[PDB]
Design a binder for this molecule. Structure first.
Ligand SMILES: CC(=O)SCCNC(=O)CCNC(=O)[C@H](O)C(C)(C)COP(=O)(O)OP(=O)(O)OC[C@H]1O[C@@H](n2cnc3c(N)ncnc32)[C@H](O)[C@@H]1OP(=O)(O)O
Ligand SMILES: Cc1ncc(C[n+]2csc(CCOP(=O)(O)OP(=O)(O)O)c2C)c(N)n1
Ligand SMILES: Cc1ncc(C[n+]2csc(CCOP(=O)(O)OP(=O)(O)O)c2C)c(N)n1
Ligand SMILES: [Mg+2]
Ligand SMILES: [Mg+2]
Lengths: 262, 390, 98, 97
């Protein structure tokens, strides 16, 4: 069960939940819930994937999403060694550190009537919140430091090393199944464009956006890195680029309550 | 009490945006905003943000400590304030109004901060500031007024009820963006109906001004008075850059007081008017546009700037000026169970007995605040104005 | 309950209208003017009725234990998938006439 | 030079989110006051609720480890140790802010 804000929501709907392009495209979509399935390429396991509805008030979905998970676990009723509905909760760095509902909800993690076997938290730490930098957003060293209060592990991973990012995802999910506690992943990345359409981010943060404007994407940087170490051959590297243009071309032209009377 | 500023003081404030320190240059998208602030104090066309800063600035010059805090409040959520400018080359910060205040010799200060992502702690902190220093001018701004429901405990238990419960007074200013512009249920309403439900015994002043100069006079009257009660202002979003809303310099230097009600500026003959529309907020400008287009000399649009306390004497004076008025319409953007209609339908007829029976013209009553489809909002706005005129 | 205003405004009272998501949540809010002060007297009925429109939720203040029984049972056994807000008593819990 | 001395209850300190939301303002430019001395009267109960249903933290005061702040757990039946902790905590606040 996923709980998340607006950033990257339609991307999650298509590549994670598995909804068809026609169903997504027909800001209302950015608040609705959805259901889908995930099959594994290198295995024979299947798992349902759900997205929960939420308002624009950041972090308000956190307690609601936990409750949805507990209700689904109680209906399956598999006992203490069960807890087979995993809560995957996404946050922003400014909202995770600043809003009190975040640690107020994590305080329910081990309680008798609220325990769901742990929650996997992902903080998309793009080191900015609209026009505010971390120096004015938190008195904590890292955004994810509420984890040290609850005796939970934190994994800070570089968003430009996708090998290290997939490893952390696996280890965090392995930790949750073995210890039944919350786990926190701080995905250290950046925000390429401004907060809205009519906003120059260099007006308020010029020095940070000197490092952001005109750099290789995570995809382009990773392809060039593999080709350099000899992990990808020249012929194999050309195929990955052709595949990136093929995925784009396919996606682009995808046009073709009553009262109980008596 | 006269709240106007001298012509000399107005030019001095405008010239502060030109007194940049040695080796400082503005970002090229902020430069024309600063250049317009220097021209406006002689030419006109003063927008909302500049009218608000002219008030905070003038108060700091007198010797007061002015504190403004909220999410992204230095630049402004709608890229409109720029109280602190940043040089793209050196990352050096410049606060023009603070420097001018310090050079007047009365230890005045203009302190602007970017809060953390918080409403409960954020607003709570600014209420505390007002209690620890009666002589300071404090304002808390919300990103959108819709997010202030996450600070409900502070609104209910301190701001609206503190004087009645403990005899503890506050002069906290709440700047809550509000306006039905089609941005959805969480970017449209600051819940006016909820604030007016907490009003009694003149507990706090609630207002929705329509002109930058009237906002200037409201803020200045509150600060220079001995009425130690909070001020809740429903601030605009699109009206920040509407050319018909801008104010002339004479509205800051010759106009002496704050206006509770603003009569219709386009009335050829008052004896020919048969309908009187009462409105509050940005909706005035849309109604006024339609009156000019259709040439309706039988309608008169009167603005209610101060919501609580009810300025029933000024509304009575305005309605007396149109002696052949057959009906009085109350027109608002907000749903029938929201906005200032529920408060005014109960109290206004009892305060003005000779007034005709008020007729509501608004959006239908809803569970939520506003639609999530932008095309539906535009259709509802057309239906609203059509209903008012026909 | 004003410390949970975000959940009342953004989910309980407005969820069906906004997203077509229904709930049958029961809010049991003690209310009654018995002289216990400003923080032990009102559940803010006026605020809940201000959020009502299009039969969004059922709001009630029953006076007898049997009527509270029938209200809870009607809500549970019906297909009206909307919330129920009940203003429950404090001193009336032990009134012999009730 | 104005010291905030803030008293809490163990059930309320751990459970209400406004507690860590306010402590997040401690080092920020417009909110810094040189540190706050927090006293949690941990009487190991909250009305009829015990700590096993009040928090998922080992100690009630564990939000301190999130903000990189020290915690002193002291026995309320040893007044010599209680006065010592009061002095050390106030000495720490003046030296590190
Ligand atoms: C139309 C209303 C609900 C706005 C006003 O109701 P009234 O007719 O004045 O009240 P009354 O209590 O008689 O309600 C009539 C019926 O509506 C039902 N009803 C009314 N309100 C509710 C509610 N909130 N939830 C469920 N059922 C309801 C009653 O069960 C009753 O059913 P019946 O046909 O078996 O008698
Ligand atoms: C409760 C609440 N307060 C304020 C806002 C206004 N707001 C929208 S986005 C934003 C900044 C988000 O920062 P961060 O959490 O870092 O997310 P990012 O946009 O960087 O992913 C704010 C303050 C909101 N949506 N909800
Ligand atoms: C915000 C809020 N929620 C609920 C209550 C009701 N209440 C009063 S005392 C209490 C328990 C307090 O427990 P603890 O914090 O351990 O304090 P103690 O009484 O043990 O000192 C509660 C739940 C309240 N006063 N305020
Ligand atoms: Mg961020
Ligand atoms: Mg206790």
């Amino acid at each position: 069960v996923i709980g998340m804000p607006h950033r990257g929501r339609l991307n999650v709907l298509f590549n994670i939940v598995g909804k068809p392009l026609a169903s997504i495209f027909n800001d209302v979509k950015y608040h609705l819930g959805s259901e889908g399935q995930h099959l594994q390429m290198f295995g024979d396991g299947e798992i349902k994937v759900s997205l929960t509805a939420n308002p624009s008030h950041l972090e308000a979905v956190n307690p609601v999403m936990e409750g949805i998970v507990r209700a689904k676990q109680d209906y399956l009723d598999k006992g203490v060694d069960g807890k087979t509905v995993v809560p995957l909760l996404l946050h922003g760095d400014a909202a995770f550190a600043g809003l009190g509902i975040v640690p107020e909800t994590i305080n329910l993690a081990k309680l008798r009537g609220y325990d769901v076997g742990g929650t996997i938290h992902i903080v998309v730490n793009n080191q900015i919140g609209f026009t505010t930098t971390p120096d004015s957003s938190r008195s904590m060293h890292y955004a994810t430091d509420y984890a040290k209060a609850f005796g939970c592990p934190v994994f800070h991973v570089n968003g430009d090393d996708p090998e290290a990012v997939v490893w952390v995802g696996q280890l965090a999910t392995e930790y949750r199944r073995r210890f039944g506690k919350d786990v926190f992943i701080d995905l250290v990345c950046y925000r390429l464009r401004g907060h809205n359409e009519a906003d120059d981010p260099s007006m308020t943060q010029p020095k940070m956006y000197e490092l952001i404007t005109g750099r290789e994407t995570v995809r382009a940087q990773y392809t060039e890195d593999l080709l350099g170490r000899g992990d990808l051959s020249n012929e194999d590297a050309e195929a990955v680029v052709r595949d990136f243009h093929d995925q784009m071309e396919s996606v682009f032209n995808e046009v073709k309550q009553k009262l109980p009377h008596g | 009490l006269e709240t106007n500023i001298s012509r000399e003081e107005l030019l001095e404030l405008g010239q502060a945006f030109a007194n940049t320190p040695e080796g400082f240059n503005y970002h090229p998208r902020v430069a024309p905003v600063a250049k317009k602030r220097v021209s406006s104090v002689t030419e006109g066309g003063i927008d909302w943000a500049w009218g608000e800063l002219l008030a905070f600035g003038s108060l700091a010059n007198s010797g007061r400590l002015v504190r403004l805090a909220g999410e992204d409040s230095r630049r402004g959520t709608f890229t409109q304030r720029h109280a602190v400018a940043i040089d793209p080359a050196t990352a050096e910060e410049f606060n023009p109004l603070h420097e001018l205040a310090q050079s007047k010799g009365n230890n005045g200060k203009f302190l602007v901060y970017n809060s953390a992502l918080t409403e409960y702690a954020g607003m709570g902190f600014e209420y505390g500031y007002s209690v620890g220093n009666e002589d300071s001018i404090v304002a808390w701004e919300a990103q959108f007024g819709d997010f202030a429901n996450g600070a409900q405990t502070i609104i209910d238990e301190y701001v609206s009820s503190g004087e009645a419960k403990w005899g503890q007074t506050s002069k906290l200013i709440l700047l809550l963006p509000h306006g039905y512009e089609g941005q959805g249920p969480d970017h449209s309403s600051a819940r006016i109906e909820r604030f007016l439900q907490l009003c009694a015994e003149g507990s706090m002043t609630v207002a929705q001004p329509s002109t930058p100069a009237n906002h200037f006079h409201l803020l200045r009257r509150h600060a220079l008075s001995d009425l130690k009660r909070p001020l809740v202002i429903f601030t605009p979003k699109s009206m920040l850059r509407n050319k018909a809303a801008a104010s002339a310099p004479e509205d800051f230097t010759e106009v002496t007081k704050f206006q509770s009600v603003i009569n219709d500026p386009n009335v050829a003959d008052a004896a020919k008017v048969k309908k009187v529309m009462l409105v509050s907020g940005k909706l005035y400008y849309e109604l006024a546009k339609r009156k000019e287009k259709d040439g309706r000399d039988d309608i008169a649009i009167v603005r209610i700037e101060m919501l609580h306390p009810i300025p029933f004497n000024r509304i009575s004076e305005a309605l007396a000026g149109y002696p052949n008025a057959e009906e009085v319409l109350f027109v608002q953007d907000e749903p029938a169970n929201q906005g200032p209609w529920p408060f005014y339908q109960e109290h206004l007829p009892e305060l003005i007995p000779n007034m005709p029976k008020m007729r509501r013209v608004s959006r239908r009553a809803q569970s939520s605040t506003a639609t999530g489809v932008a095309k539906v909002h535009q259709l509802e706005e057309k239906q609203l104005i059509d209903e008012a005129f026909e």
